Amino acid sequence: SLKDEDRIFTNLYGRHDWRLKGAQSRGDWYKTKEILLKGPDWILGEVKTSGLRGRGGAGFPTGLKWSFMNKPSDGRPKYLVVNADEGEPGTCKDREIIRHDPHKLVEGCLVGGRAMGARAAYIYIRGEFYNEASNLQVAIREAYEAGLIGKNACGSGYDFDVFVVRGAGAYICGEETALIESIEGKQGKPRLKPPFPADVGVFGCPTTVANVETVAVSPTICRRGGAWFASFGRERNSGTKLFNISGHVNNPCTVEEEMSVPLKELIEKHAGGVTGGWDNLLAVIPGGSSTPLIPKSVCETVLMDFDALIQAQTGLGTAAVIVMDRSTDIVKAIARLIEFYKHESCGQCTPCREGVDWMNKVMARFVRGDARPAEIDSLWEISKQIEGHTICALGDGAAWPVQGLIRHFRPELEERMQQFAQQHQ
Amino acid sequence: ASATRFIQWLRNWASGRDLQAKLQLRYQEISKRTQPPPKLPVGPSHKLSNNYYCTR
Numbered sequence: 281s282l283k284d285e286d287r288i289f290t291n292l293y294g295r296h297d298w299r300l301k302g303a304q305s306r307g308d309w310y311k312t313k314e315i316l317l318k319g320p321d322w323i324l325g326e327v328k329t330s331g332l333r334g335r336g337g338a339g340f341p342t343g344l345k346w347s348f349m350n351k352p353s354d355g356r357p358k359y360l361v362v363n364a365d366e367g368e369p370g371t372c373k374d375r376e377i378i379r380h381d382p383h384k385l386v387e388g389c390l391v392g393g394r395a396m397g398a399r400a401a402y403i404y405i406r407g408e409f410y411n412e413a414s415n416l417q418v419a420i421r422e423a424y425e426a427g428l429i430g431k432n433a434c435g436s437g438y439d440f441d442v443f444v445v446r447g448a449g450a451y452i453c454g455e456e457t458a459l460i461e462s463i464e465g466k467q468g469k470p471r472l473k474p475p476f477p478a479d480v481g482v483f484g485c486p487t488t489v490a491n492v493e494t495v496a497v498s499p500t501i502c503r504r505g506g507a508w509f510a511s512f513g514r515e516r517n518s519g520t521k522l523f524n525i526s527g528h529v530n531n532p533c534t535v536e537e538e539m540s541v542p543l544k545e546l547i548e549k550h551a552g553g554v555t556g557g558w559d560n561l562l563a564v565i566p567g568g569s570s571t572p573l574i575p576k577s578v579c580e581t582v583l584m585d586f587d588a589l590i591q592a593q594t595g596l597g598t599a600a601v602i603v604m605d606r607s608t609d610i611v612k613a614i615a616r617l618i619e620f621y622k623h624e625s626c627g628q629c630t631p632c633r634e635g636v637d638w639m640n641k642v643m644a645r646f647v648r649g650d651a652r653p654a655e656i657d658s659l660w661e662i663s664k665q666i667e668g669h670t671i672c673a674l675g676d677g678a679a680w681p682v683q684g685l686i687r688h689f690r691p692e693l694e695e696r697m698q699q700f701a702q703q704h705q
Numbered sequence: 706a707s708a709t710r711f712i713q714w715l716r717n718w719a720s721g722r723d724l725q726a727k728l729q730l731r732y733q734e735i736s737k738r739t740q741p742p743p744k745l746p747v748g749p750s751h752k753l754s755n756n757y758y759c760t761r
């Protein structure tokens with residue numbers, strides 16, 4: 281019932297030595313000829329039966345999401361979009377899954393090629409990653425020259441070629457409409473999701489946006505057994521998600537741990553700073569930056585799962601650990617995260633461009649402590665107003681963590697406010 | 706005669722008691738320039754949180 285320690289049979293293995301010829305020796309592209317020969321009903325049906333959750337910072341299940349982009353009849357040719365850009369600060373899945381083992385992500389494009397019915401595949405990498413982009417292109421150069429992608433792919437009629445497209449230092453490549461608009465040529469602003477979803481219009485084509493970690497699970501489900509990825513973890517949340525332990529820790533390391541693992545044991549397996557949850561003031565974030573900060577009272581009992589964490593009023597989506605020490609300031613740290621959202625908000629929705637930017641200016645006062653005690657109670661209502669009324673989910677991501685400053689905290693905020701007001705006046 | 710001492714006896718004698726509360730009656734307790742600058746208090750609004758017009 282409980283989550284297994286690390287798991288000996290893991291999906292991700294490339295970390296020590298792999299280039300191009302080493303991928304065949306490790307265990308990649310083994311059943312590529314058999315997977316391409318199999319129909320779309322067998323490929324998408326296996327993914328639906330396994331029940332693999334969304335690896336990206338959304339929380340939406342993949343099994344239903346891939347089904348919309350099946351396309352029975354369409355005029356415009358279908359495309360495949362793989363968003364490999366780095367998400368929230370803390371999540372370092374992009375730097376590990378692309379630079380070390382690039383062929384694992386390339387196998388997902390071929391496996392998801394015949395399944396979705398894609399004519400051309402796009403791999404979108406962030407502008408900050410240039411050393412990772414050089415390794416990704418060289419692996420694609422070795423793949424195309426060998427004769428496995430393009431024209432005739434593993435003895436099949438479907439011809440799909442992967443092309444790397446570099447961004448330019450933008451966080452607004454997160455949303456499904458945002459990454460589509462960035463590759464389209466226009467400014468990096470997300471289109472309205474309710475009328476035209478991903479399957480309706482993306483670069484003038486019915487497409488599907490997927491994370492690099494989510495794309496890496498597709499050859500693991502196809503080549504190896506479907507029950508192997510389904511059994512490990514919880515009943516609702518399935519699939520081994522790479523959770524990176526970062527922040528105030530003695531040894532920060534990204535580990536490929538199984539789903540529904542306890543947070544007290546997760547810090548112990550990667551070796552934390554002061555303690556797992558005793559010595560240091562526990563204000564560790566269950567997500568990258570989007571999720572609200574978890575208190576010391578509810579941390580050891582709570583499990584790091586895709587569904588179970590949301591029930592404890594801290595929805596982990598980005599799948600990253602950000603631990604905070606007793607010596608480090610809690611208020612000053614999250615105020616920088618809001619300042620991060622100030623720089624990285626696109627500027628469409630007025631509750632975000634004039635909301636989050638206004639939220640940062642109020643939060644800057646809270647660090648110095650020149651605010652009224654009534655201002656804490658007000659700010660909780662503004663954060664509620666931002667969360668519900670936005671185009672993209674960055675408005676959500678800048679609303680959840682500031683609500684975490686109101687819940688479980690507030691004696692920390694009042695003591696900073698009362699002492700600074702008495703000293704100045 | 707214009708002396709107040711003798712006159713006050715006459716006005717008290719001729720129908721009803723007088724003396725106090727004069728016709729002019731603007732001698733003492735008449736504050737000029739009102740007061741030092743005051744601060745006007747705010748109602749059930751002004752203080753933030755739960756001040757929606759949906760409720761009001």
Ligand SMILES: Cc1cc2nc3c(=O)[nH]c(=O)nc-3n(C[C@H](O)[C@H](O)[C@H](O)COP(=O)(O)O)c2cc1C
Pocket residue numbers: 333334335336337338339340341342345363364365366367368453454455456457489490491492494495570673674677
């Ligand atoms: C603040 C925020 C940032 C995100 N950043 C990324 C990202 O960098 N890359 C990505 O693939 N998905 C990101 N996502 C998830 C998106 O919603 C994505 O378009 C899609 O849902 C991923 O689908 P999948 O989980 O089925 O792969 C982000 C979500 C949020 C709320």
Ligand code: SF4
Pocket residue numbers: 452469470624625626627628629630632633670671672673674675676
């Ligand atoms: S929520 Fe903010 S970042 Fe997202 S589309 Fe609206 S204005 Fe742009």
